Every structure is written in C-alpha cells, then in structure tokens.
Amino acid sequence: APEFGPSCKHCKDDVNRLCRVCACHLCGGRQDPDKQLMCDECDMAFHIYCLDPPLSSVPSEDEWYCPECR
Ligand SMILES: [Mg+2]
Ligand SMILES: [Zn+2]
Ligand SMILES: [Zn+2]
Ligand SMILES: [Zn+2]
Ligand SMILES: [Zn+2]
C-alpha cells in the first residue's frame, strides 16, 4: 500500500519470527509492546524485563539510552 512504509528489512514483518531490529533488540520478541523501551539515540527497542538489571515498569521520563549507547 503506498500509504504504509515498507516491511522490516530484516524479518519482513513475519510475526512467527524473532527480530532484533524491529522488536526487542535483546530477545527479538514482539510481545508486550507497552513494555518496550526505545533508545533516544539508536531507536532500538528493549523489553524492560530483558535489561540488566530488569526494570519492573517503564521510566516516567522520555529520555532513555540503551546499554549499547550509554
Ligand atoms: Mg525516549
Ligand atoms: Zn523486523
Ligand atoms: Zn545491538
Ligand atoms: Zn526482550
Ligand atoms: Zn541505543
């Protein structure tokens, strides 16, 4: 559809497939989008429970940098 961006280059939006590019950058899982924190710098997303130490909730502040970018 010319009204939508093209599929993920890496997984082609196959929901049965892990993808560390468009879903959690550590586990590649798509579940819990509500719980996926996006890096202000590289735009990769991370489940709060995949981080070390894991977070039990997302921060209230908008500015967050991932393990790779810190
Ligand atoms: Mg942010
Ligand atoms: Zn993908
Ligand atoms: Zn990485
Ligand atoms: Zn994850
Ligand atoms: Zn980052």
Curated annotation (Swiss-Prot):
**Residue ranges covered by zinc fingers (PHD-type):** 16-70
What tissues contain this protein? Expressed in thymus, bone marrow, testis, lung and heart. Overexpressed in breast cancer.
Per the UniProt record, the site (Histone H3K4me0 binding) maps to: C22
In terms of superkingdom, the source organism counts as Eukaryota
Induction of its expression: Up-regulated in proliferating cells, and down-regulated in quiescent cells. Down-regulated upon adriamycin-induced DNA damage, in a p53/TP53 and CDKN1A-dependent way. Induced by E2F1 transcription factor.
Q: Which spans are transmembrane here?
A: none
Question: Cellular location of this protein?
Answer: Nucleus
| Annotated region described as Histone H3R2me0 binding, given as residue ranges | 39-43, 59-61
Task: Summarize what the UniProt record says about post-translational modification.
Answer: Ubiquitinated; which leads to proteasomal degradation. Autoubiquitinated; interaction with USP7 leads to deubiquitination and prevents degradation. Polyubiquitination may be stimulated by DNA damage.
| Residues of the site described as Histone H3R2me0 binding | P33, Q36
Quaternary assembly: Interacts with DNMT3A and DNMT3B. Interacts with DNMT1; the interaction is direct. Interacts with USP7; leading to its deubiquitination. Interacts with histone H3. Interacts with HDAC1, but not with HDAC2. Interacts with BLTP3A. Interacts with PML. Interacts with EHMT2. Binds hemimethylated CpG containing oligonucleotides. Interacts with ZNF263; recruited to the SIX3 promoter along with other proteins involved in chromatin modification and transcriptional corepression where it contributes to transcriptional repression. Interacts with UHRF2. Interacts with FANCD2.
Q: Which disease is it linked to?
A: Defects in UHRF1 may be a cause of cancers. Overexpressed in many different forms of human cancers, including bladder, breast, cervical, colorectal and prostate cancers, as well as pancreatic adenocarcinomas, rhabdomyosarcomas and gliomas. Plays an important role in the correlation of histone modification and gene silencing in cancer progression. Expression is associated with a poor prognosis in patients with various cancers, suggesting that it participates in cancer progression.
The written remark on domains in the entry is: The tudor-like regions specifically recognize and bind histone H3 unmethylated at 'Arg-2' (H3R2me0), while the PHD-type zinc finger specifically recognizes and binds histone H3 trimethylated at 'Lys-9' (H3K9me3). The tudor-like regions simultaneously recognizes H3K9me3 through a conserved aromatic cage in the first tudor-like subdomain and unmodified H3K4 (H3K4me0) within a groove between the tandem subdomains. The YDG domain (also named SRA domain) specifically recognizes and binds hemimethylated DNA at replication forks (DNA that is only methylated on the mother strand of replicating DNA). It contains a binding pocket that accommodates the 5-methylcytosine that is flipped out of the duplex DNA. 2 specialized loops reach through the resulting gap in the DNA from both the major and the minor grooves to read the other 3 bases of the CpG duplex. The major groove loop confers both specificity for the CpG dinucleotide and discrimination against methylation of deoxycytidine of the complementary strand.
Q: What is the documented function of this protein?
A: Multidomain protein that acts as a key epigenetic regulator by bridging DNA methylation and chromatin modification. Specifically recognizes and binds hemimethylated DNA at replication forks via its YDG domain and recruits DNMT1 methyltransferase to ensure faithful propagation of the DNA methylation patterns through DNA replication.
Q: What is this protein called?
A: E3 ubiquitin-protein ligase UHRF1
Source organism: Homo sapiens (Human)
Q: What's the source species' lineage?
A: Eukaryota, Metazoa, Chordata, Craniata, Vertebrata
